[PDB]
Protein backbone atom coordinates (compact mmCIF):
# COMPACT_ATOMS: atom_id res chain seq x y z
CA UNK A 1 0.00 0.00 0.00
CA UNK A 2 2.79 2.44 0.86
CA UNK A 3 4.71 1.80 -2.37
CA UNK A 4 1.62 1.89 -4.59
CA UNK A 5 0.30 5.08 -2.99
CA UNK A 6 3.73 6.67 -3.47
CA UNK A 7 3.56 5.64 -7.13
CA UNK A 8 0.04 7.07 -7.42
CA UNK A 9 1.10 10.38 -5.84
CA UNK A 10 3.94 10.74 -8.36
CA UNK A 11 1.40 9.95 -11.10
CA UNK A 12 3.36 6.76 -11.78
CA UNK A 13 2.14 3.22 -12.26
CA UNK A 14 2.49 0.37 -9.80
CA UNK A 15 4.46 -2.75 -10.73
CA UNK A 16 4.34 -5.41 -8.00
CA UNK A 17 6.47 -8.38 -9.02
CA UNK A 18 7.45 -11.74 -7.61
CA UNK A 19 6.72 -15.46 -7.82
CA UNK A 20 3.13 -16.46 -8.49
CA UNK A 21 0.88 -16.88 -5.47
CA UNK A 22 2.26 -14.08 -3.28
CA UNK A 23 -0.81 -11.84 -3.51
CA UNK A 24 -0.02 -9.16 -6.08
CA UNK A 25 -3.24 -8.94 -8.10
CA UNK A 26 -5.32 -9.31 -4.94
CA UNK A 27 -3.27 -6.64 -3.16
CA UNK A 28 -3.76 -4.21 -6.06
CA UNK A 29 -7.49 -4.95 -6.14
CA UNK A 30 -7.76 -4.52 -2.36
CA UNK A 31 -6.00 -1.15 -2.53
CA UNK A 32 -8.29 -0.06 -5.35
CA UNK A 33 -11.39 -1.11 -3.43
CA UNK A 34 -10.11 0.60 -0.28
CA UNK A 35 -10.10 3.84 -2.30
CA UNK A 36 -13.51 2.97 -3.75
CA UNK A 37 -12.26 2.60 -7.33
CA UNK A 38 -13.38 0.46 -10.26
CA UNK A 39 -10.49 -1.99 -10.70
CA UNK A 40 -10.47 -3.92 -13.97
CA UNK A 41 -8.29 -7.03 -14.17
CA UNK A 42 -6.83 -7.96 -17.56
CA UNK A 43 -5.02 -11.24 -18.26
CA UNK A 44 -2.46 -10.03 -20.78
CA UNK A 45 -0.94 -12.13 -23.56
CA UNK A 46 0.95 -11.65 -26.82
CA UNK A 47 -2.26 -10.59 -28.59
CA UNK A 48 -2.50 -7.37 -26.51
CA UNK B 1 -20.13 -63.20 -67.33
CA UNK B 2 -18.25 -61.97 -64.29
CA UNK B 3 -18.11 -65.30 -62.45
CA UNK B 4 -18.49 -68.03 -65.08
CA UNK B 5 -15.65 -66.69 -67.23
CA UNK B 6 -12.25 -66.33 -65.58
CA UNK B 7 -10.68 -64.52 -68.56
CA UNK B 8 -12.58 -61.27 -67.88
CA UNK B 9 -10.55 -61.12 -64.66
CA UNK B 10 -7.41 -60.60 -66.75
CA UNK B 11 -8.96 -58.38 -69.42
CA UNK B 12 -11.28 -56.25 -67.23
CA UNK B 13 -9.90 -56.10 -63.67
CA UNK B 14 -11.41 -52.75 -62.68
CA UNK B 15 -14.76 -53.65 -64.26
CA UNK B 16 -14.73 -56.87 -62.24
CA UNK B 17 -13.95 -54.92 -59.06
CA UNK B 18 -16.82 -52.46 -59.51
CA UNK B 19 -19.20 -55.28 -60.40
CA UNK B 20 -18.10 -57.18 -57.29
CA UNK B 21 -18.84 -54.12 -55.16
CA UNK B 22 -22.27 -53.80 -56.81
CA UNK B 23 -22.86 -57.52 -56.26
CA UNK B 24 -22.04 -57.28 -52.55
CA UNK B 25 -24.40 -54.32 -52.17
CA UNK B 26 -27.16 -56.14 -54.08
CA UNK B 27 -26.68 -59.33 -52.04
CA UNK B 28 -26.86 -57.37 -48.78
CA UNK B 29 -30.07 -55.67 -49.89
CA UNK B 30 -31.46 -59.03 -51.04
CA UNK B 31 -30.65 -60.55 -47.65
CA UNK B 32 -32.51 -57.68 -46.00
CA UNK B 33 -35.44 -58.48 -48.30
CA UNK B 34 -35.19 -62.21 -47.54
CA UNK B 35 -35.22 -61.90 -43.75
CA UNK B 36 -38.54 -60.01 -44.06
CA UNK B 37 -40.29 -61.30 -47.21
CA UNK B 38 -43.25 -59.06 -46.38
CA UNK B 39 -43.72 -56.49 -49.14
CA UNK B 40 -44.17 -53.50 -46.84
CA UNK B 41 -41.09 -54.35 -44.76
CA UNK B 42 -39.12 -54.18 -48.01
CA UNK B 43 -40.90 -50.92 -48.88
CA UNK B 44 -40.01 -49.46 -45.46
CA UNK B 45 -36.28 -50.18 -45.78
CA UNK B 46 -34.39 -46.93 -45.24
CA UNK B 47 -33.51 -45.43 -48.62
CA UNK B 48 -34.44 -48.54 -50.60
CA UNK B 49 -35.66 -46.59 -53.64
Amino acid sequence: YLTMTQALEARLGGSPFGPAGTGKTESVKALGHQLGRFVLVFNCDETF
Amino acid sequence: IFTGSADIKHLLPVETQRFQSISTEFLALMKKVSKSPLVMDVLNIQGVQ
Binding site: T3, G14, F17, K24 | -
Partner: protein, 242 residues
Protein backbone atom coordinates in the same frame (compact mmCIF):
# COMPACT_ATOMS: atom_id res chain seq x y z
CA UNK C 1 10.84 3.97 -15.44
CA UNK C 2 7.09 4.72 -15.66
CA UNK C 3 6.30 2.24 -12.86
CA UNK C 4 7.31 1.81 -9.22
CA UNK C 5 8.29 -1.81 -8.60
CA UNK C 6 7.69 -3.66 -5.33
CA UNK C 7 8.95 -7.19 -4.63
CA UNK C 8 6.26 -9.37 -3.03
CA UNK C 9 8.24 -12.56 -2.44
CA UNK C 10 7.16 -14.03 0.92
CA UNK C 11 3.53 -13.45 1.91
CA UNK C 12 2.80 -13.62 5.64
CA UNK C 13 0.92 -16.91 5.56
CA UNK C 14 0.79 -17.30 9.35
CA UNK C 15 -0.91 -13.94 9.91
CA UNK C 16 -3.39 -14.58 7.09
CA UNK C 17 -4.30 -17.97 8.55
CA UNK C 18 -4.61 -16.53 12.07
CA UNK C 19 -6.85 -13.62 11.10
CA UNK C 20 -9.03 -15.50 8.61
CA UNK C 21 -9.57 -18.39 11.03
CA UNK C 22 -10.40 -15.89 13.79
CA UNK C 23 -12.95 -14.12 11.59
CA UNK C 24 -14.74 -17.35 10.63
CA UNK C 25 -15.57 -18.15 14.27
CA UNK C 26 -12.73 -20.45 15.35
CA UNK C 27 -11.91 -20.03 19.04
CA UNK C 28 -8.48 -21.69 18.71
CA UNK C 29 -7.47 -19.64 15.66
CA UNK C 30 -4.00 -18.92 17.06
CA UNK C 31 -3.17 -22.59 17.70
CA UNK C 32 -4.91 -23.68 14.50
CA UNK C 33 -2.83 -21.27 12.40
CA UNK C 34 0.41 -22.16 14.22
CA UNK C 35 -0.39 -25.79 13.42
CA UNK C 36 -1.62 -25.40 9.84
CA UNK C 37 1.07 -23.15 8.34
CA UNK C 38 4.07 -25.25 9.49
CA UNK C 39 2.05 -28.26 8.36
CA UNK C 40 1.99 -26.85 4.82
CA UNK C 41 5.73 -26.17 5.05
CA UNK C 42 6.21 -29.79 6.14
CA UNK C 43 4.09 -31.02 3.24
CA UNK C 44 6.25 -28.98 0.86
CA UNK C 45 9.56 -30.17 2.32
CA UNK C 46 8.74 -33.78 3.31
CA UNK C 47 6.64 -35.26 0.51
CA UNK C 48 8.11 -36.42 -2.77
CA UNK C 49 8.66 -33.75 -5.42
CA UNK C 50 5.93 -33.90 -8.06
CA UNK C 51 5.13 -31.54 -10.91
CA UNK C 52 1.47 -31.37 -9.80
CA UNK C 53 2.11 -30.46 -6.15
CA UNK C 54 1.22 -27.03 -4.79
CA UNK C 55 1.45 -26.00 -1.13
CA UNK C 56 1.46 -22.22 -1.52
CA UNK C 57 -0.84 -19.44 -0.41
CA UNK C 58 -3.64 -20.44 -2.80
CA UNK C 59 -3.79 -23.93 -1.30
CA UNK C 60 -3.83 -22.53 2.24
CA UNK C 61 -6.58 -20.05 1.35
CA UNK C 62 -8.68 -22.80 -0.22
CA UNK C 63 -8.14 -25.06 2.80
CA UNK C 64 -9.23 -22.35 5.24
CA UNK C 65 -12.27 -21.36 3.15
CA UNK C 66 -13.29 -25.03 3.06
CA UNK C 67 -12.69 -25.18 6.82
CA UNK C 68 -15.13 -22.33 7.38
CA UNK C 69 -17.71 -23.92 5.08
CA UNK C 70 -17.30 -27.31 6.78
CA UNK C 71 -17.69 -25.74 10.23
CA UNK C 72 -20.91 -24.07 9.09
CA UNK C 73 -22.19 -27.36 7.67
CA UNK C 74 -21.31 -29.25 10.86
CA UNK C 75 -23.06 -26.64 13.01
CA UNK C 76 -26.16 -26.90 10.82
CA UNK C 77 -26.08 -30.71 11.03
CA UNK C 78 -25.72 -30.57 14.82
CA UNK C 79 -28.68 -28.20 15.04
CA UNK C 80 -30.80 -30.49 12.85
CA UNK C 81 -29.92 -33.66 14.77
CA UNK C 82 -30.54 -31.97 18.13
CA UNK C 83 -33.89 -30.64 16.91
CA UNK C 84 -34.92 -34.14 15.81
CA UNK C 85 -33.61 -35.66 19.08
CA UNK C 86 -35.06 -33.23 21.63
CA UNK C 87 -35.03 -29.49 22.36
CA UNK C 88 -31.68 -28.25 23.70
CA UNK C 89 -30.29 -26.15 20.82
CA UNK C 90 -28.30 -23.04 21.73
CA UNK C 91 -25.40 -21.30 20.04
CA UNK C 92 -23.11 -21.30 23.09
CA UNK C 93 -22.60 -24.99 23.83
CA UNK C 94 -22.67 -25.88 20.12
CA UNK C 95 -19.80 -23.44 19.57
CA UNK C 96 -18.00 -24.73 22.67
CA UNK C 97 -18.60 -28.44 21.93
CA UNK C 98 -17.21 -28.39 18.40
CA UNK C 99 -14.11 -30.22 17.03
CA UNK C 100 -12.35 -27.41 15.18
CA UNK C 101 -9.18 -29.48 14.78
CA UNK C 102 -11.17 -32.30 13.19
CA UNK C 103 -12.82 -29.81 10.83
CA UNK C 104 -9.43 -28.44 9.77
CA UNK C 105 -8.09 -31.96 9.20
CA UNK C 106 -11.21 -32.79 7.17
CA UNK C 107 -10.65 -29.76 4.95
CA UNK C 108 -6.95 -30.59 4.52
CA UNK C 109 -7.79 -34.18 3.55
CA UNK C 110 -10.54 -33.03 1.19
CA UNK C 111 -8.16 -30.67 -0.60
CA UNK C 112 -4.70 -32.25 -0.40
CA UNK C 113 -5.37 -36.01 -0.52
CA UNK C 114 -6.68 -36.32 -4.13
CA UNK C 115 -3.44 -34.86 -5.51
CA UNK C 116 -1.12 -37.26 -3.69
CA UNK C 117 0.70 -40.18 -5.29
CA UNK C 118 0.22 -43.61 -3.74
CA UNK C 119 3.39 -43.55 -1.63
CA UNK C 120 2.80 -40.03 -0.26
CA UNK C 121 -0.53 -40.70 1.50
CA UNK C 122 1.08 -42.51 4.49
CA UNK C 123 3.57 -39.65 4.73
CA UNK C 124 0.74 -37.11 4.74
CA UNK C 125 -1.17 -38.96 7.45
CA UNK C 126 1.98 -39.39 9.56
CA UNK C 127 2.57 -35.64 9.26
CA UNK C 128 -1.05 -35.00 10.24
CA UNK C 129 -0.66 -37.23 13.30
CA UNK C 130 2.59 -35.47 14.23
CA UNK C 131 1.09 -31.98 13.95
CA UNK C 132 -2.51 -32.82 15.01
CA UNK C 133 -2.21 -35.73 17.46
CA UNK C 134 -5.21 -37.94 18.12
CA UNK C 135 -7.32 -36.33 15.38
CA UNK C 136 -8.62 -38.80 12.80
CA UNK C 137 -10.12 -38.20 9.36
CA UNK C 138 -13.28 -40.19 8.57
CA UNK C 139 -14.78 -39.44 5.16
CA UNK C 140 -18.55 -39.63 4.97
CA UNK C 141 -19.84 -42.35 2.67
CA UNK C 142 -21.89 -40.81 -0.15
CA UNK C 143 -24.22 -43.80 -0.38
CA UNK C 144 -26.72 -42.37 -2.88
CA UNK C 145 -23.93 -41.13 -5.14
CA UNK C 146 -22.28 -44.56 -4.95
CA UNK C 147 -25.51 -46.31 -5.96
CA UNK C 148 -25.85 -43.92 -8.90
CA UNK C 149 -22.22 -44.64 -9.82
CA UNK C 150 -22.89 -48.38 -9.68
CA UNK C 151 -25.96 -48.03 -11.91
CA UNK C 152 -24.01 -45.93 -14.43
CA UNK C 153 -21.10 -48.38 -14.40
CA UNK C 154 -23.44 -51.31 -15.05
CA UNK C 155 -25.14 -49.36 -17.84
CA UNK C 156 -21.83 -48.49 -19.54
CA UNK C 157 -20.05 -51.84 -18.86
CA UNK C 158 -17.76 -50.21 -16.28
CA UNK C 159 -16.36 -52.16 -13.33
CA UNK C 160 -17.75 -50.53 -10.20
CA UNK C 161 -16.16 -51.49 -6.90
CA UNK C 162 -15.84 -50.66 -3.20
CA UNK C 163 -13.15 -50.80 -0.55
CA UNK C 164 -10.37 -53.19 -1.56
CA UNK C 165 -12.42 -54.88 -4.28
CA UNK C 166 -11.32 -54.63 -7.90
CA UNK C 167 -12.40 -51.14 -8.93
CA UNK C 168 -12.43 -49.64 -5.44
CA UNK C 169 -9.56 -47.25 -6.16
CA UNK C 170 -11.29 -45.96 -9.30
CA UNK C 171 -14.53 -45.27 -7.40
CA UNK C 172 -12.48 -43.57 -4.68
CA UNK C 173 -10.93 -41.37 -7.36
CA UNK C 174 -14.40 -40.56 -8.72
CA UNK C 175 -15.60 -39.54 -5.25
CA UNK C 176 -12.50 -37.39 -4.75
CA UNK C 177 -13.14 -35.77 -8.14
CA UNK C 178 -16.70 -35.00 -7.03
CA UNK C 179 -15.42 -33.40 -3.81
CA UNK C 180 -12.90 -31.27 -5.71
CA UNK C 181 -15.64 -30.29 -8.18
CA UNK C 182 -17.71 -29.02 -5.26
CA UNK C 183 -14.72 -27.16 -3.80
CA UNK C 184 -13.00 -25.82 -6.93
CA UNK C 185 -14.26 -24.38 -10.21
CA UNK C 186 -11.03 -25.41 -11.94
CA UNK C 187 -10.25 -29.12 -12.30
CA UNK C 188 -7.11 -30.93 -13.41
CA UNK C 189 -6.95 -34.73 -13.61
CA UNK C 190 -3.31 -35.82 -13.83
CA UNK C 191 -2.20 -39.38 -14.47
CA UNK C 192 -0.51 -41.63 -17.02
CA UNK C 193 -2.25 -42.54 -20.25
CA UNK C 194 -5.14 -44.93 -19.77
CA UNK C 195 -5.49 -44.49 -16.01
CA UNK C 196 -9.28 -44.08 -16.01
CA UNK C 197 -9.64 -40.28 -16.01
CA UNK C 198 -12.08 -39.94 -18.91
CA UNK C 199 -14.33 -42.73 -17.66
CA UNK C 200 -14.11 -41.31 -14.13
CA UNK C 201 -15.43 -37.89 -15.08
CA UNK C 202 -17.98 -39.25 -17.58
CA UNK C 203 -19.41 -41.66 -14.99
CA UNK C 204 -19.45 -38.88 -12.39
CA UNK C 205 -21.31 -36.59 -14.79
CA UNK C 206 -23.93 -39.25 -15.56
CA UNK C 207 -24.30 -40.15 -11.87
CA UNK C 208 -24.80 -36.50 -10.92
CA UNK C 209 -27.35 -36.08 -13.71
CA UNK C 210 -29.32 -39.12 -12.52
CA UNK C 211 -29.06 -38.17 -8.83
CA UNK C 212 -29.63 -34.41 -8.67
CA UNK C 213 -31.96 -34.37 -11.69
CA UNK C 214 -30.01 -31.62 -13.48
CA UNK C 215 -28.72 -32.49 -16.94
CA UNK C 216 -24.94 -32.44 -17.39
CA UNK C 217 -23.40 -31.18 -20.63
CA UNK C 218 -19.73 -31.83 -21.38
CA UNK C 219 -17.68 -29.89 -23.93
CA UNK C 220 -14.42 -31.69 -24.74
CA UNK C 221 -11.78 -29.47 -26.34
CA UNK C 222 -8.33 -30.45 -27.55
CA UNK C 223 -6.45 -27.18 -26.93
CA UNK C 224 -3.35 -28.29 -28.87
CA UNK C 225 -5.09 -29.78 -31.92
CA UNK C 226 -5.86 -26.18 -32.98
CA UNK C 227 -3.98 -22.91 -32.89
CA UNK C 228 -4.35 -20.58 -29.92
CA UNK C 229 -6.01 -18.11 -32.29
CA UNK C 230 -8.68 -20.73 -33.00
CA UNK C 231 -8.85 -21.66 -29.31
CA UNK C 232 -9.50 -18.16 -27.94
CA UNK C 233 -10.16 -15.80 -30.86
CA UNK C 234 -8.60 -13.19 -33.13
CA UNK C 235 -8.74 -9.40 -33.24
CA UNK C 236 -8.75 -8.40 -36.90
CA UNK C 237 -5.59 -6.38 -37.68
CA UNK C 238 -7.46 -4.37 -40.34
CA UNK C 239 -11.10 -3.95 -39.26
CA UNK C 240 -10.47 -4.30 -35.49
CA UNK C 241 -13.31 -6.84 -35.37
CA UNK C 242 -13.40 -9.77 -32.97
Amino acid sequence: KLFRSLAMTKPDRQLIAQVMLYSQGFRTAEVLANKIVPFFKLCDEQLSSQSHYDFGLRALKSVLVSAGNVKRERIQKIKREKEERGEAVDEGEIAENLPEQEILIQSVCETMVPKLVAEDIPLLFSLLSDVFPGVQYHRGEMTALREELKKVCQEMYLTYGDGEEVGGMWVEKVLQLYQITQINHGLMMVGPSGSGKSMAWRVLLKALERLEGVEGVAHIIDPKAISKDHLYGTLDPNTREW
